[PDB]
Amino acid sequence: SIPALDYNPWEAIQLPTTATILDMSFIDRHHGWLVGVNATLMETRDGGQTWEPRTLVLDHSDYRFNSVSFQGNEGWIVGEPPIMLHTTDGGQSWSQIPLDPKLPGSPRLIKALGNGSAEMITNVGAIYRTKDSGKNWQALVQEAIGVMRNLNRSPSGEYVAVSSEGSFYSTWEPGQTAWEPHNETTSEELHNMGFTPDGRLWMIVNGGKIAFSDPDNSENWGELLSPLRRNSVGFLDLAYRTPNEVWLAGGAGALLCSQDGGQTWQQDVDVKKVPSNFYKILFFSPDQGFILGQKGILLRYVTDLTAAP
């Protein structure tokens, strides 16, 4: 079995809820919001150590809040069935923005660009942009691609979308008028994909394997790596805290850390006790990170008091 990690930086926090949390975003170091199932909406003022519920005046509370994104005090929330909320004062007040009924599918992701601009993607891949605080939306891609298994965004605004059956993945970048399908890269079933901090792609495929794209050609993939060397445990999300430290979350309390960019892995055994699947990792800076779970449990990253840099 792989070596145990020396320090466990992940602290469990019980939110005042049992809803599953789906996304999180910070205005600044201390002031942030998280969202989830059942119109769950909570605020922190102390960097995510403590969270306060916020109730919205909605027509109903069955909304699934999928995505929250801030740029400064300007913030956006989208969910299903189609709903979009906007704030200009860091969430002190939230306004509902009417969506076009002709929107194909429901909003899955929203990205605040600041100064009234935002980009939104539906769960079938329609991409819309606003420059006027949501009054008007330009369609950047209307040719839908079907339900996505996972969707991630690069720093330069590229998107990668895993197809519904994991048979392929699709990419899009500003300028393109349709998603680009990428077929037969792997013989394995794709689960999740995203971007590294050096401009490569990563993928999790079913069976607990991962791979990184070739820096010479993002169409080509390196060897399938098995972080645990056993096929038994599948992974759900991968995220970098720094260019070299990668965290990988999976089923059955699996949480692995690599300090060399994903070649060698150690296991965080202290979190096997925590009763939640770890479905999503978010780092906001090298000292601020969260692992999103079920039953209102949230892991918070706590920097090592004996590590110097």
Q: Give the whole-angstrom CA distance, residue 268 versus residue 5.
A: 5
Q: Which two tokens stand for residue 71?
A: 């740029």
Q: Give the whole-angstrom CA distance, residue 70 versus residue 89.
A: 11
- Per the listing, tokens 């792989």 go with 2
Q: Which two tokens stand for residue 303?
A: 């920097």
Residue 210 has a CB neighbour count (10 Å cut-off) of 23
Strand residue runs (E) in 123-174: 127-130, 138-141, 148-153, 159-163, 168-172
Which run of H or of E encompasses 249? strand 246-250
Q: How is residue 189 annotated by DSSP?
A: P
Residue 141 has a CB neighbour count (10 Å cut-off) of 18
Q: Which two tokens stand for residue 158?
A: 């590229």
Strand residue runs (E) in 206-245: 209-214, 217-221, 235-240
Nearest of 49, 35, 109, 85 to residue 292 by alpha carbon: 35
Which run of H or of E encompasses 201? strand 201-205
Cα 225 to its chain centre, rounded Å, is 22
Q: Which two tokens stand for residue 184?
A: 């037969």
Q: Which two tokens stand for residue 78?
A: 């989208």
- Beta bridge partner(s), residue 217: 214
Q: Give the whole-angstrom CA distance, residue 165 versus residue 192.
A: 11
State the method: X-ray
Q: Give the whole-angstrom CA distance, residue 20 versus residue 7.
A: 27
Which run of H or of E encompasses 117? strand 117-122
- Beta bridge partner(s), residue 77: 68, 85
Q: Is the peptide bond before 53 cis (omega within 30 degrees of 0)?
A: no
Q: How is residue 225 annotated by DSSP?
A: B
Q: Give the whole-angstrom CA distance, residue 146 versus residue 29.
A: 37
Q: Which two tokens stand for residue 224?
A: 């399938």
Q: Give the whole-angstrom CA distance, residue 103 versus residue 121.
A: 10
Q: Give the whole-angstrom CA distance, residue 64 versus residue 213.
A: 33
Q: Given strand 10-14, what is the order of strands in its sheet?
A: 10-14, 297-301, 288-292, 280-285
Q: Give the whole-angstrom CA distance, residue 73 versus residue 232.
A: 44
- Per the listing, tokens 């969707």 go with 151
82-87 long-range Cβ contacts below 8 angstroms, 24+ apart: 82/106, 82/107, 83/58, 83/107, 84/110, 84/120, 84/134, 85/56, 86/133, 86/134
Q: Count H helices, E strands: the chain?
A: 0, 28
Q: Give the whole-angstrom CA distance, residue 275 versus residue 230.
A: 22
Can you tell me whether residue 27 is helix, strand or coil? coil
**What phi, psi does 26 have (nearest 5°)?**
-110, 135
Q: Which two tokens stand for residue 104?
A: 């194909």
Q: Give the whole-angstrom CA distance, residue 157 versus residue 141.
A: 14
Q: Is the peptide bond before 81 cis (omega within 30 degrees of 0)?
A: yes
Which residues, in sequence order, are CB contacts of 200 under 8 Å at separation 6+?
Answer: 212, 213, 214, 215, 218
Can you tell me whether residue 145 is helix, strand or coil? coil
Find out whether 152 and 194 touch, Cβ atoms under 8 Å: yes
Q: Which two tokens stand for residue 304?
A: 């090592």
